């Protein structure tokens, strides 16, 4: 009868984790209140008290997105899981789908779109670029899409995509606007209803400083109508918006068991939303803008070059630096964690090998942290081998 | 000029009630798991995170009793693991046989339909289980590529026998997928020895970790089918080729796919360390004994167990026939209102027919049996009887 697999020796040792100052494109470090919420005991996942916390979270999401949309809720997964929830519900097989492919995030949207049978049309742009109204209109006119995807904060390239006017333009072409604000939310201006966005989503782990694992999403009535009139069922059950809507209190029926929400992660997310509700959006935008401007000045004084030349196009939360000539970017990243216990990153997708990425996210977006990463980079530039 | 003002409810502190959770799960968290949930973040692609991931993988191989290389965590709840299994294993048009003896088989049918399989339910009333002979007829008639069976049917209180089923499926060139969300750690289960090709469970049952992560492992036969199919799975998030790579299961450097739930992995790591320290067979013994003690106390109250055959009772989730004359909703409310204990009614086909009492992991104790027994005694004495 004897078990062949034995208790793993490594698990018989205590868990211990290193102390790391996370100054990459995210996830970010957690403030005390969010760590404390993470250590709390479970409550019933369909209890009145749980529903009250969920309702508070929904109010918080409506605040940070600046929307009145009733159909606003949490997706029980990471930012990719929220994008897939948007696409698997809004798009039916054969639907035309226009995508701003200007970095890895647009590429990921193309991949998901293809998999669920859309007719996908990328607008491809080198890393560093953004879309104009004219570029979008040309795509809308040519491809007659039911949905456009735009990345607001392109954290792979350091770009801040302008959003004014795009929603109205899409709507003239009978197109819904979907916007990724995972890296932008809380760090730079964003107004869902004022900007005519139809589907907006973000993640817990960037400027909100919650642990990775949950994501935030909201749907206009136009998007709501399309999702509820579909004649095909979405390919996913877990992400079916009719079930999720009901369980999050968004429709007129009693909440029915769908899947078990991540109770403890929702405590933490609730607290992250309370913190930014206390600080205020505009104050948070100012904090990130100023920290970013300070970082840009210090990096240039090190002799590094910002990847995005035009300051109005720079994403405050994630700054791209050209890799300095003669260095191997891997040495610089390794040097910084090895000798300073600071995380930064290289590039990602099309910016792989071209940039270093430095994040300033929420409570970590400070002049004091700018000074730490500046000194770490200075030392890497002094000691890493140069060709 | 901002449209939306800060919500006043969020300007108050978070406060949660104390609840003793003795339903079908999620279960309460032991102090070590709560402490891990309170730790600081590390880098989601850091060397230290990969080591923790590797320790988790060894833990899963331990609790499943497998050596499969393709073993990993799904970043979502038990439904998400089931969808990962089916969306990668099944291509559109594949024949899919399902043991629909409660809500969990019904859910498998729904997902299977959505992803274009040709679904064949074997439908049984709540309380039933499948024999080898009934599965063999389904295999012969429908020539499925995959069979789904629920091991611990937490909606009906049933313990499904597993010996023999994998071997049967393989004679018919069918893969065996088993849901062990409710049974893992609380009753015997051997992935390799029972010939199971896909096995999954959840964090929040007997493991006593918070909900939100799930455990999955694939045999070489399942691995071969997933890596052979000519169509891409409908999901990117759940694509096994990307996930296998990031979890260190394949021959290539780990590439970014999606950000794993760092803090939840700390907690799941500790949940696996705890049962590694206890030892699997000791855990099985604890659940078996706690459930037998529960069964006698409940019968001594005049209650009737829903599953008549003791060998068919799932130790982790016990169903009780709702007693004649009472409104089950009054009984459930009485227990939370006056004793701060959570129990449940039924689910899916058992709705209105049962109360469900869970004994899960560190909560599967004689002490907790005494607590819920006293609460039900009081409920029977004070709830209205028709
Ligand atoms: C608890 C349970 C599930 C739960 O899945 P979630 O998606 O995490 O809610 C699924 N199947 C069984 C048998 C369970 O007991
Ligand atoms: C961090 C980020 C994501 C990542 O999502 P995960 O699935 O949580 O890893 C997606 N898009 C953008 C713009 C991001 O900054």
Author numbering:
A (entry chain A): 4 to 390
B (entry chain B): 5 to 390
Authors' own words:
D183N is a pathogenic variant of AGT that causes Primary Hyperoxaluria Type I (PH1), a severe disorder of glyoxylate metabolism. Although the mutation is conservative, the variant shows a 2.3 × 104 fold reduction of the catalytic efficiency, whereas the affinity for PLP is almost unchanged. Following our novel hypothesis, and to understand if the low catalytic efficiency may be due to a non-native geometrical strain, we have solved the structure of the D183N mutant at 1.8 Å resolution and at a similar pH value (pH 5.5 vs 5.0) of the wild type. The structure of D183N shows that the interaction of the asparagine side chain with N1 is loosen, going from a 2.6 Å distance in the wild type to 3.0 Å. Clearly, the H-bond between the mutated Asn amino group and the deprotonated pyridine N1 is not as strong as the salt bridge present in the wild type enzyme. Therefore, in the mutant the opposite torsion effect is uncoupled and the spring mechanism, responsible for the tilt of the PLP pyridine plane during the transaldimination step, is lost. In the D183N variant the H-bond replacing the salt bridge isn’t strong enough to keep the internal aldimine under strain and the pyridine plane is tilted towards the si side, whereas in the S187F variant the salt bridge is conserved but the counter pulling force of the Schiff base linkage is lost, due to the rearrangement of the Lys-209 loop, and the pyridine plane of the internal aldimine is tilted towards the re side.
AGT normally localises in the peroxisomes and failure of its detoxification role leads to increased levels of oxalate, coming from oxidation of glyoxylate, causing calcium oxalate precipitation in the kidney and urinary tract. Many pathogenic variants of AGT cause PH1 (primary hyperoxaluria type I), a rare autosomal recessive disorder.
